[PDB]
Nucleic acid binder design. Structure first.
Ligand SMILES: [Mg+2]
Ligand SMILES: [Mg+2]
Ligand SMILES: [Mg+2]
Ligand SMILES: [Mg+2]
Ligand SMILES: [Mg+2]
Ligand SMILES: [Mg+2]
Ligand SMILES: [Mg+2]
Ligand SMILES: [Mg+2]
Ligand SMILES: [Mg+2]
Ligand SMILES: [Mg+2]
Ligand SMILES: [Mg+2]
Ligand SMILES: [Mg+2]
Ligand SMILES: [Mg+2]
Ligand SMILES: [Mg+2]
Ligand SMILES: [Mg+2]
Ligand SMILES: [Mg+2]
Ligand SMILES: [Mg+2]
Ligand SMILES: [Mg+2]
Ligand SMILES: [Mg+2]
Ligand SMILES: [Mg+2]
Ligand SMILES: [Mg+2]
Ligand SMILES: [Mg+2]
Ligand SMILES: [Mg+2]
Ligand SMILES: [Mg+2]
Ligand SMILES: [Mg+2]
Ligand SMILES: [Mg+2]
Ligand SMILES: [Mg+2]
Ligand SMILES: [Mg+2]
Lengths: 85, 82, 205, 80
RNA sequence: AAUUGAAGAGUUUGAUCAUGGCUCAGAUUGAACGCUGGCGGCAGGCCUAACACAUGCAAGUCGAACGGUAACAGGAAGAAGCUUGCUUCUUUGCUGACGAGUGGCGGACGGGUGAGUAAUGUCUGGGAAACUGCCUGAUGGAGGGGGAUAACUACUGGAAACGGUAGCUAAUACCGCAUAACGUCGCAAGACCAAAGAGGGGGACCUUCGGGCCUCUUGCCAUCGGAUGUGCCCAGAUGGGAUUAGCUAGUAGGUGGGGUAACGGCUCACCUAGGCGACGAUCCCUAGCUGGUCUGAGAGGAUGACCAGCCACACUGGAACUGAGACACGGUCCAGACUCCUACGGGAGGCAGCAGUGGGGAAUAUUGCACAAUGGGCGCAAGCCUGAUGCAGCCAUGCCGCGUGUAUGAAGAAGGCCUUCGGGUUGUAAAGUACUUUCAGCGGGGAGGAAGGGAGUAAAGUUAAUACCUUUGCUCAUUGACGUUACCCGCAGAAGAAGCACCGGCUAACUCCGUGCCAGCAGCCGCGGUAAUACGGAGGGUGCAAGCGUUAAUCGGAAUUACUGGGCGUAAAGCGCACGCAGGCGGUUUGUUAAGUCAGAUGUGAAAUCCCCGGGCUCAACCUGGGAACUGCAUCUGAUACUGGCAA
């Protein structure tokens, strides 16, 4: 507002919208797996886990979700799928 | 990050620095990891103008600490009484 | 700082000569010693304990030409030093540079020696020392500066100092105007009238 | 050997949990008399079947629920 | 070497001894006020309104990340009036550089304040279920593509703030794909995740002759480490009030799901009725905590100003984004109070950052110089920024040091005061005489804080390269705000430099005159109603001294909250008596435990400060080397006399 920090403000805004888009995509991919588990279709749950796994793994690499959270999601969903099957 | 620097602790117009191992983000006279040695710009004719133990300096340098300009100059000047 | 006033008044009040003059006279002739100062000078002869303690303290202070604050600092240092407090205090008082100059005899009085020291006529260990309260240590050579040497003041003070007490704790050349502080004066080396053990209690009150 | 504590259970019914009272005999800072204090703490234990007047061995462990960071190790004798 | 430590007095009575209060002698302060005031060194300087703020400054930096010519410091071409070959004027990014823009790092550091917080913080001692920009060790990769956008152009709304529409463009910006182990998910088979280039130099072989190619430096990506920082958990300690006794429903516990970097009612669904509290819960008042400081012989009491560590906050309330790290002092959004600008359509603001202003108050300073040194941010470096910091200005606010001259000097001068009117005192005091010039003032000389950085050479290192680059030596110009520096030297001249309180006892120091219970004094006892050592003045004297005194506050004296270390027949003080829960204490004999207790060892108890021995500022204050202390806490190993537990 008084120093050239308006550049930081603009960068923060654009990064905010970008990261929000990525987060929404990842959350959609994660939630469809839970929908499959609730439906009880083992094949659908496994198929939804497969293509979702690279998304979370790569978003962890990009510096948006972190390895521990990325692994937590995979571990929980794998446990649920194994129990269902 | 750990670094070796000076800390002015003398008096007005009579500086007396102390070489300390401290995190860079801390203040000049703030918290330091440990104290290595001292330095007196007013050397005079006394038998003690500058002293520091090289063992811990080498320990920290090989552990990943940096050296300020004045501290590096002092190290290479003292070497061993030469 | 200094007193800057009549000198015989101090001796009259204290009842004894404090060595505030050259020595040729001003001991009996123009003193009226033992008569106390002022209008009620003679018509008084009574004193309390606290009175005698204060009188002894002021006697020492007026002998050595010091003020209350500096004397209290000296007392604190003497108490801090391990040993006998009175002996430490007397040694500290005797170790003053101006007092040492007077003992060596380069000055007729403490005031004259202090004036020399302030006017930069005394050197210690081959260096100038302008401070009168400078503390002299054992094995120290005290001498007059090479330049401005052979002055009427010191010339007229040596022969007077030739024989008064002959101090034994320091050496005097009496030639090139040099001396030496080889040891620290022992109590014995210093009078006997002073009851230091009254000042010690005065500063305990 | 690991650091532990010893105290009496005197705990009420609870699912896999018990409160223990560690007794210590400390000296009064000012008056110098020796007096006894108490420090009740909650302990986790599965297969919990401890009584009221039981002496138990307690050990500090990972935070297990709030107000619970201790677990039992051994029980010496019983109440009755 | 570091334990050399302890004083009382006045006042109740005709007098005495007790008890018991009040007062004084000491030390200390971020002090204020009155009188006075020469110099220097070191330190300190809004304690009240977390009241409101005009103005200036306090966070920028990278062209060696990328598009670019808006400044303009060069050069070249071309057109030209020509100085007649030298100038000028439009293009032109080749160029030393660079406003604006994208991108990276930094803005979470430094600095300010003590509102809130009574334990969710702090101190001590431990722990496990975590992350960590920059800095470092090791082991491995660094292949090939894509689509946009700012800047920039053409229009348009605006008083401003600030925009909107339509086109073009680069990257270490962004996004797939190739690649996948020691990494993630799984018991396993298995599945899956990344990358950026840039700069210096130059042989051979090839170039759309804008470079490929070789080498060197630096940069990027993944895993395991190190170090540093941060997050979390446990025990003990850390104010007052019982004229506050009951308080708690996500409350206490469990199963499952969710969530965080990480454990966890952190959050949901369900199940149980639990949890805290007299060893003080809940409620109310006050308060940042500590190392430390003051005082005290000690134990204790008071306190947290400066310095250092931690915490909390940034006009008030709330929220989250970005980021490694904020729920962010000079960021964002919403709401509120207040203020300001306006062309009335609409906008802006946060000094508890450094100066400074208004206000409040007994009270607290310059709208200063420099990045020379130290330390931070960016950068390969040069270098830029830095109200951090180094200095300077104001204040006797404190501690320390020096000076305001020295020697002689009887006619004991004159005047003042007293005087039994003999004289005494002021008083060697003054005058006079003989000497010196510290410090002020004038004139000269001149350390240290300066190490580095730069330019040029020699050696070594690396390599296809005598290149370029790095390291190590050598040579040449240098870099100071302080600064009319510290310090030294020379001239002249006692010349420019002393005041404050008190004098009845406590308590050191007495006479006269004025007044007459009036005026007045007074810390306590108390003085003054015509002979006042107590009021006012004078003389004299005592104490301290560039200070002196008064007021405010803490400790001491006060053994006057008595743990060390007090009392209750009559001075205050035994409940009217009794029974009894909790609590406190408990005869004797042995065994056992080892909790209390005692012994040794280890770890720790930041630095500074206090103390002992030393060193440097001309001595001191001040600065500084080593030690001691840091009386504590935790763990381990032993002792078993006593207390406790168990058994007989
Ligand atoms: Mg600026
Ligand atoms: Mg630019
Ligand atoms: Mg800070
Ligand atoms: Mg990238
Ligand atoms: Mg992949
Ligand atoms: Mg759970
Ligand atoms: Mg918890
Ligand atoms: Mg006491
Ligand atoms: Mg306190
Ligand atoms: Mg984030
Ligand atoms: Mg900020
Ligand atoms: Mg501000
Ligand atoms: Mg300010
Ligand atoms: Mg006012
Ligand atoms: Mg003084
Ligand atoms: Mg120089
Ligand atoms: Mg008297
Ligand atoms: Mg009268
Ligand atoms: Mg007491
Ligand atoms: Mg009593
Ligand atoms: Mg009775
Ligand atoms: Mg009974
Ligand atoms: Mg017994
Ligand atoms: Mg034991
Ligand atoms: Mg010395
Ligand atoms: Mg020291
Ligand atoms: Mg310490
Ligand atoms: Mg027994």
């Amino acid at each position: 507002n008084i120093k050239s920090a308006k550049k930081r403000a603009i960068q923060s805004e654009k990064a905010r919208k970008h990261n929000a888009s990525r987060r929404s995509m990842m959350r959609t991919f994660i939630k469809k797996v839970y929908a499959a588990i609730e439906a009880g279709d083992k094949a659908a749950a496994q198929k939804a886990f497969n293509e979702m796994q690279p998304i979370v793994d790569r978003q962890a690499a990009k510096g948006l979700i972190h390895k521990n959270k990325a692994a937590r999601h995979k571990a929980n969903l794998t446990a649920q799928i194994n129990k269902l099957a | 990050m750990v670094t070796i620097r000076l800390a002015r602790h003398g008096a007005k117009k009579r500086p007396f620095y102390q070489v300390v191992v401290a995190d860079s983000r801390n203040a000049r006279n703030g918290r330091f990891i440990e104290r290595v040695g001292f330095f007196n710009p007013i050397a005079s004719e006394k038998e003690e103008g500058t002293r520091l133990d090289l063992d811990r300096i080498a320990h920290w340098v090989g552990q990943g600490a940096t050296i300020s300009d004045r501290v590096a100059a002092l190290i290479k000047e003292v070497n061993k009484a030469a | 700082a200094r007193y800057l006033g009549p000198k015989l008044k101090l001796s009259r009040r204290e009842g004894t000569d404090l060595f505030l003059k050259s020595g040729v006279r001003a001991i009996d002739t123009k003193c009226k010693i033992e008569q106390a100062p002022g209008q009620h000078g003679a018509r008084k002869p009574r004193l309390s304990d606290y009175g005698v303690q204060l009188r002894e303290k002021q006697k020492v202070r007026r002998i050595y030409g010091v003020l209350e604050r500096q004397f209290r600092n000296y007392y604190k240092e003497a108490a801090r030093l391990k040993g006998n407090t009175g002996e430490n205090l007397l040694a500290l008082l005797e170790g003053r540079l101006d007092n040492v100059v007077y003992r060596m005899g380069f000055g007729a009085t403490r005031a004259e020696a202090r004036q020399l020291v302030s006017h930069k006529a005394i050197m210690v260990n081959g260096r100038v020392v302008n401070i009168a309260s400078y503390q002299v240590s054992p094995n120290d050579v005290v001498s007059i500066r090479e330049k401005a040497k052979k002055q009427s003041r010191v010339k007229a003070a040596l022969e007077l100092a030739e024989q008064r007490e002959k101090p034994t704790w320091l050496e005097v050349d009496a030639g090139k105007m040099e001396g030496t502080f080889k040891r620290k004066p022992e109590r014995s080396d210093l009078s006997a009238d002073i009851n230091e053990h009254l000042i010690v209690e005065l500063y305990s009150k | 050997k690991i650091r532990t504590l010893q105290g009496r259970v005197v705990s009420d019914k609870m699912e896999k949990s018990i409160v223990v009272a560690i007794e210590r005999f400390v000296k009064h800072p000012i008056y110098g008399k020796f007096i006894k204090r108490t420090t009740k703490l909650h302990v986790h234990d599965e297969n919990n079947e401890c009584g009221i007047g039981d002496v138990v061995e307690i050990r500090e462990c990972r935070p297990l629920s709030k107000t619970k960071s201790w677990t039992l190790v051994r029980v010496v004798e019983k109440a009755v």
